[model samples]
Target: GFDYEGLIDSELQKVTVWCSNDYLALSKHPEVLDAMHKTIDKYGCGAGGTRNIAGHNIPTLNLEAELATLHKKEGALVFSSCYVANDAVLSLLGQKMKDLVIFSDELNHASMIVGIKHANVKKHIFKHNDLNELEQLLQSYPKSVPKLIAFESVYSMAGSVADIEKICDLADKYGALTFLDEVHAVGLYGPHGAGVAEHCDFESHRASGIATPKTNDKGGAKTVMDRVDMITGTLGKSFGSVGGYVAASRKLIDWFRSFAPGFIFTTTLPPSVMAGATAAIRYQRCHIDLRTSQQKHTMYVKKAFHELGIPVIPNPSHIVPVLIGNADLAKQASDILINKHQIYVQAINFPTVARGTERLRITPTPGHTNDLSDILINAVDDVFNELQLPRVRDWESQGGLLGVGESGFVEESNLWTSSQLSLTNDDLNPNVRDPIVKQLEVSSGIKQ
Candidate 1:
């Protein structure tokens, strides 16, 4: 019985929400809304059919081109969701290749698990972010056998990051392909919102600042992004829309387009959806402030939670997972926060995590200003007090779990460096802003 409505009561309240996948809230951006409205007026609602049938339109083509450009890939393909993208790509690859093997991170999303399951090939599940374990698995397989290492830029629930460069190095050493899921990191990490793969080339990206097909001096140099074989991302997360995509070499993309049942069978996303997502992606590409503000607020919230004796799980990424450790208590705390304190932060129970590792996954957005954060902080503090939730010291007394009050725990350096956080939109190349939308404007006869 999935009675989420009854669980939260669904009553509209004046609550400041702290849980959402829309990291930048670009879903509500005026430009994105305008693009949707205009596209809907001109093209109507439905895509009318799948890409091969009839629905492959200008907006879809533009979006695929934009994604490829953003990721510095030879091509890209859009899917109804990243779930389908992952499933179709992985399964098709394994099913078609004679002796393909997949090495995946232990904590990969359910979509990835489903994909790997359907892939129906020899596979290994490496320990989460454990390079040593991953290498051991890779070593077990011969170099002659085809291999694909599938992992994510950011592990959404824990906010832990994978070492993209190290993994790529492993892939090179073992003669394997790399498939990276940038679902949570796009529009939240990297200079151009290309995810952690792009972030690894921080200095290059920072200096070039959104220059597509960067100049010869800046380009031509092999980047971390270039080394990876495939990148899958979600438009629903940081991009603030509903869709998924995979950017790769043109050869690989064409193969998926031709063979993947998920792509060939499903109806394409509507014109308005594609148009809105394109606007959001282009908008985020130019705005460094949005990412910086969100990161800064996350820092602020973590600091306040620490000072107030809350047990926040330690991670370098933007997620602030407050450790509650008990399922019933976590649910009670959430209900109390929403019903009593007018703050909405959902409790993450078992199945999403281990039985005793229940938590409240708090995501700080750009709109979560100092004032808004203060209200949340105070409310959370009161809830902790009222619920008598275990604090850091309490966890320490019990020997800890997941970095909470662990005696040997070392705080991780944040993914965003101070210098990177200080960068402004002014630092970006002038040409990076609105390149796609400019083309749209011209084609729509609005700019002439």
Candidate 2:
């Protein structure tokens, strides 16, 4: 009944893909491949132990140093994934900070939420991109109390960029530390692909001497690097490998190294993976044009969706989401694209996004050709039109979920048809219903 093998088969064979998080398109790079091959030859397959023991190796240490230098932090600690880095660090800080107060953005990734949960500290959530709310929350707390403002530089799902300058200013005013997740922006932003903070001049201090001032304009790269206390990033997304890390003070790194259960208890990442990540980072530095190309692809897809009257989240960031409010329709649209058009994109549903706010999360990468964008646009246009779904509008115009009503017509039939049917008491046959009830009673073996 499951049809497991059939389900596992590829849904699309000939279509070009536009939905992947491999932003740098480095998964197939020669350097990364060569590193993996060399590592395999030297270390075999696995690390064979936890980091505290035999697993600690040259590749891991060098990669950590490389990342720290890149981000302009005092030191860096590696983990199996970016999620783990977020989880371990948040949990550790939350538990260690006495009278800790955490200010978090509403739209942070799920992994961040999980990390915040483990800390068991006093938490305040600011509305998405609401600087006023964040400032007010920070002001309400005592300046002397240990506090952390956790947020992302680029929100992947919504394609929204955070106001990092505002966040840092408020943190400084409140004597609070900043924890920024650069997973989405790394290797695809900044002058040299450092990240959004570097791109926006928020962490420009990291680039002090590396970036020359032009016409008295200070180096933005150095400014951003000096602003934040801690940064979290993922190797899998843009680095074209597996694992995650946190760049922070050496003392903090040492503390996490000794205490974080996730890092201490688990087997460390294999040398091959770390070696690949190192090679990927170096490759990204030289191949900045590849990242530039990916950004071009992202812009093209966004524009295509816009022209096709498909509702897309408006932001310069690479991620793009096409809104399909009805859950069933959203799922069906993805299926049609995959099955008929050979375009593969996941239907983001409830919980990943808010209820009735389902969408298709599309990430166009550098490998995607211009013709691919056209095909994707045409397929999406045809599917939505055939389904009689509302023509796409600006995400801002919809005011998010609240703006749904302004779309002119509510697809009432679609909503009603999707609701499940149930039998009421009045519709049941009395004798048959009694026997069924009796069977339940007998199965329970309860005395009357």
Worst 10-residue lDDT window, candidate 1: 438-447
| Candidate maximizing TM-score | 1
TM-score of 2: 0.82
> Model 2, residue 265: displacement in angstroms?
2.0
- Candidate 1's TM-score: 0.92
**CA lDDT of 207 in candidate 1?**
67
Query: TM-score for each prediction?
Result: 0.92, 0.82
Tens digits of lDDT, candidate 1, 355-380: 99999999999988989999989998
Candidate 1's clash total is: 0
Clashing pairs in 1: none
Query: How do the residues 304-332 of candidate 2 rate in per-residue lDDT, one tens digit apiece?
Result: 77667787745556777887888999999
Error of 1 at 404 (Å): 1.5
